Design a protein around this motif. Structure first.
Motif: not given
Lengths: 12, 202, 202, 14, 202, 12, 202, 16
Positions: A8-12
């Motif tokens: 996961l590279l992007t925020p949740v």
């Protein structure tokens, strides 16, 4: 596929 | 076959943009970094064929992505929590160590910096409550954090943002360092796609 | 330079993925399509330099994306309006007609397909109100459009999901039909990236 | 611009 | 809570400026209208509260904005397409009809007006293909307009800007009617703000 | 999207 | 007529947002600050009374906008575009000492900060030549800056971003510092609108 | 094209 969640590279 | 060709291209594509992301991060072009990050994130659901041939740049990208958002306390990179981006970066650091098979020594040098930044960023954002929590859970151990951890408590207690420690901490400076460190454990290789793009423009 | 270099790869990447998008749609692998769609979407924020070079394939991609989501009536592609995916596809069809400088004779047959599908899907989902709206607004006129229109109204007024026009409409059939219409307006050349993945792997 | 992401919107706004 | 105060004010400001924009339009003071419109645009990125209260306001503003700009054909309000301001005005008109719950009967006379001016203006402008395009897409349809379809159609091929239809067409006259129309489906008022200025310019 | 949904000014 | 009433509402609106702008800046919500800024920019074309009644907060707001953009070196507020935002801020800062008739003793510290930040930011962005120009233009006399101006030259020529003058300079700290300076020469009037807003949710 | 006011005199935004 998990890849997008295992690295996961992007925020949740 | 048609599937094998897509995998090979996804890897070239993924590696190409990773290279560009680091270049953006290095030139302090965080807006470009984020856009490239989103491109890479979308690519992760597609067949890549060989985790290990990419496992390493992916962990570095993860760390950098969290660090790049480190100033947005309400950004949450983790599934179940309210971990600040910097706390998440700390955890990605453990993964890097484990998977790049690095010593605790080569690592604690950077892990120390991420903790310091994590606490300070909270303080600069008035999130004294959380600053106190991260400080206690991550820092309070003891090489020579020993007095930095103490100034930090006093700074929190007093809501003192005028303290040199807070005053003289630059996120951009911390940022670029974390890139130097993270970058240093990656191979030199120019991406194939960029190589071809150079033959094209001659 | 290093900037004119990304543009060129971004162009190759866009074109390569559009092909894989068509391949997946053609094979009825709509999840793959949606995934490649998001990759392409993420890519649009980046510099592509030569717009007129991607413009056509992008308009076709747009139509396909709205058609692929045609059964999710709660899905919208308008900032401004309350439009079902198929109503949006129609607008794209109009843009495609103008920017491809197509004649009405060629566009109208497929546009009637999208109106038929837009009304029927509403019907199948029992949104008889949205259906009449779309019907009244789109096949509102009169030639041949004279029998199906009436049938549809009658089917609507009657909430008749069992009618044959409803019972024998297959979204799959409709989808593949639109892909064929759109494909016949493109130069189906092999993407640079795929040619290289071929030199590269064999 | 990058509006190419808005002008050629491939994904649901939603 | 400091946030919900801003929300309340922003709502007062939007309503106040919308009120002044109509006033300006009403007085054929189009430059002022344009400066106020831009202010409202800059205001939309902000927390407005709840969109049930300014959405009718907002839609009419959209229609007027597109109408006040209808003579500049190189100007576009569409994000995806090359639409003349008056084509985009038609689409807004449609949202108004759907959201204001009006009937085709109440709305067809104005929209009809819009179709006419969109074509005439293209014509009064030597833009003959767009003129044809707009006419075949919007007017190449109804009953009571055939005679007009056919006259505007010939005026096109012969380039008869010398025609009674064209010469006696008045956009200023057009604009004012559209405002009269849109106004009749909107309250009248005095915005809390304007009311409080008098209560003090006291 | 109030700004894009109720867009008042020309994109252009 | 209805004019003098808009003019007073404009003023009130201008002052309301100025207040929020400072509030966003003070809380480090620079995104919110720029959106508010844009609204204010758009109001400036409207009639506001007589400069004096707003010339004071408009200058502070001017200095703050350039400072907020201080890190984007390809951004310019000057007509010809040969000025970095911080260079523009220095100018605005002089206009404030001249217009507010502040004593040199009340301005040198802050003016010295903007000069240091102007050079240092270029350095962190590796605009060593830009940094040289700015340094030699504002720091030659500017005496007792003897150590600093002399340290910087070496930092530039050795391209030493690891130097502590660079490493311990934080833009966030510089911004809040400047805001405190600017704010002190102000009138943080609880604008009429926030008070009306309160008197209403109260 | 037209009447700007104190928009440039007190410019708050970039030209860029």
């Amino acid at each position: 596929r998990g890849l997008a969640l295992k690295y996961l590279l992007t925020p949740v | 076959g048609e599937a094998r060709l897509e995998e090979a291209v996804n890897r070239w594509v993924l590696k190409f943009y990773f290279h560009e992301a680091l270049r953006a991060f290095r030139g302090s072009r965080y807006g470009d970094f984020r856009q490239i990050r989103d491109i890479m994130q979308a690519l992760l659901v597609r067949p890549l064929g060989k985790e290990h041939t990419v496992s390493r740049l992916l962990r570095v990208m993860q760390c950098l992505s969290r660090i790049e958002e480190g100033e947005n306390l309400d950004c949450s990179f983790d599934m179940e929590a309210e971990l600040t981006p910097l706390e998440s970066a700390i955890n990605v650091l453990e993964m890097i160590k484990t998977e790049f098979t690095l010593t605790e020594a080569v690592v604690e040098s950077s892990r120390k910096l991420v903790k310091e930044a994590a606490v300070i960023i909270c303080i600069k954002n008035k999130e004294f409550e959380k600053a106190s929590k991260i400080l206690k859970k991550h820092m309070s151990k003891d090489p020579t954090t020993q007095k930095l951890r103490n100034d930090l408590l006093n700074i929190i207690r007093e809501k003192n943002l005028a303290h040199p420690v807070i005053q003289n901490f630059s996120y951009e400076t911390f940022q670029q360092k974390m890139l130097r460190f993270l970058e240093s454990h990656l191979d030199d290789a120019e991406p194939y796609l960029l190589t071809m793009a150079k033959k094209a423009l001659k």
